[PDB]
Amino acid sequence: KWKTVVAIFVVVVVYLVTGGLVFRALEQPFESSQKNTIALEKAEFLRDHVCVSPQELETLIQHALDADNAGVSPIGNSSNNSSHWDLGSAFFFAGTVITTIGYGNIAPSTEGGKIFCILYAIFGIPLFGFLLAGIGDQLGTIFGKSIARVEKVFRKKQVSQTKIRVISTILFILAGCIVFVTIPAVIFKYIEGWTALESIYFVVVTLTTVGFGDFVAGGNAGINYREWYKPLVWFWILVGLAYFAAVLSMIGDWLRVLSKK
Amino acid sequence: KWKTVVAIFVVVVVYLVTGGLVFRALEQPFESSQKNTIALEKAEFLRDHVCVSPQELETLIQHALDADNAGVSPIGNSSNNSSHWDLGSAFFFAGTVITTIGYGNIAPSTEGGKIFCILYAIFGIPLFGFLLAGIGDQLGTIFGKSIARVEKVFRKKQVSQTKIRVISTILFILAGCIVFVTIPAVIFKYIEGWTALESIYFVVVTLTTVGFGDFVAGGNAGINYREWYKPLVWFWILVGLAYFAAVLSMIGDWLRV
Ligand SMILES: [K+]
Ligand SMILES: [K+]
Ligand SMILES: [K+]
């Protein structure tokens, strides 16, 4: 019904205003802190290095940013050996577009690169949708057979179909939270050398297809990653996304029969 | 069948290898160009400014990047008046997480900010799913009633149901391409001050929920945006996403029958 659609809309607008106030309270003090630190460090550099003019400083900072925007770190000369568009990294970038994660640590700079990216997303995102619905249907049948087995057991125990379906879904959600969320975060903690939080934050930001790109697997210039690392990460992204898609498909299929009745 | 699932997988792996080689050919020459330019400009700064040590330079460049990562432009001090976490911009950030766009121009820096963001996405993304399916079902009924009206008219004209349905869907797709793709891109071109391509690229990357963050509406520290701009951008994202979801649902309902 539309009456409940407007109800969902009010809850969402309230949730965004709430979220907004919480994010402000948590991040604005640090944002205002870094605002002051940069202003101090720049004014400090100019007073410590008299031979540098304020405009000469601005020109360099601009050059540093211009390079960083293109995906080239303006730190060190030895870093000019590792590419972001090599077959391997270009494969993982292509997959980043197709999964709608769109990390953002690297993006097309060329006009043609942007043109191709528009067309690559337009046809590629539905192509992945088919693969995800493919694995989603296969896993959904396995979920359906598993729930049917539990349904026959708890039917004798005098338990409602909705109560069985709800508890089963929580269990499937928890199963994926260990296998595809907890276990890989622990692996990223040791491999990438991130904190316990940064690792879980990365996995959540990844598997939700939010993809901030403030944390990317196989992104460190310092860490000497193995050849199988980046393909294993995208493979985990594929199995992980398909698992939570198969659970979401299962919930959606039940709600469609609920709307019909 | 599982045999047909492996078939799609090969097409996807081929598509990624294809896409990868094209992106390489388009971006690697520029990436290698900028690699050389920064190496020259830095070495140039040190030879032009003898009083600056190579490490003293690295320390400053690091400070400039550290600020940029936190969402503070290391260009000018007057820019330190425009916030990224003010109620309006914080509402838009909240809205970016929920829609799974996650731009990446700005992200939570605080440990607590990251903790809240994990929980905010866990409950917020399904909450949006319901709203998108909600508007998707309501608009889908309107699009079903519209096509049924046209179907009764052209049935007497001896036109097949598939031919009517196909032409109608193309028209609904084209309608959204003007209202939610063309018209907003033209608005962002004038407001944000982007090129014709950059604005269409933004609208496409935004609506496909890819969200690279290399372009974001209401992201410029220099541009003095209106109070209504940042939320309206998200409301366009809401109406736009729901419209194309409702068209996709309509095609999906026909394929099931
Ligand atoms: K997404
Ligand atoms: K995204
Ligand atoms: K993103």
UniProtKB/Swiss-Prot annotation, chain B:
Binding site for K(+) 3: 102-103, 211-212
Coiled coil: none
Region (Selectivity filter 1): 100-105
Compartment annotation: Cell membrane
Domains: entry comment: Each subunit contributes two pore-forming domains 1 and 2 which assemble to form a single pore with M2 and M4 transmembrane helices lining the central cavity and M1 and M3 facing the lipid bilayer. The transmembrane helices are bridged by the selectivity filters 1 and 2 carrying a signature sequence TxTTxGYGD that coordinate the permeant ions. Up to four ions can simultaneously occupy the selectivity filter and at least two elementary charges must translocate across the filter to convert it into the open conformation.
Complexes and interactors: Homodimer; disulfide-linked. Forms heterodimers with other 2-pore domain K(+) channel subunits, such as KCNK2, KCNK4 and KCNK18.
Function: K(+) channel that conducts voltage-dependent outward rectifying currents upon membrane depolarization. Voltage sensing is coupled to K(+) electrochemical gradient in an 'ion flux gating' mode where outward but not inward ion flow opens the gate. Converts to voltage-independent 'leak' conductance mode upon stimulation by various stimuli including mechanical membrane stretch, acidic pH, heat and lipids. Homo- and heterodimerizes to form functional channels with distinct regulatory and gating properties.
Protein name per its UniProtKB record: Potassium channel subfamily K member 10
Organism of this sequence: Homo sapiens
Lineage: Eukaryota, Metazoa, Chordata, Craniata, Vertebrata
Gene for this chain: KCNK10
Residue span relative to the full protein: 68 to 324 of 538
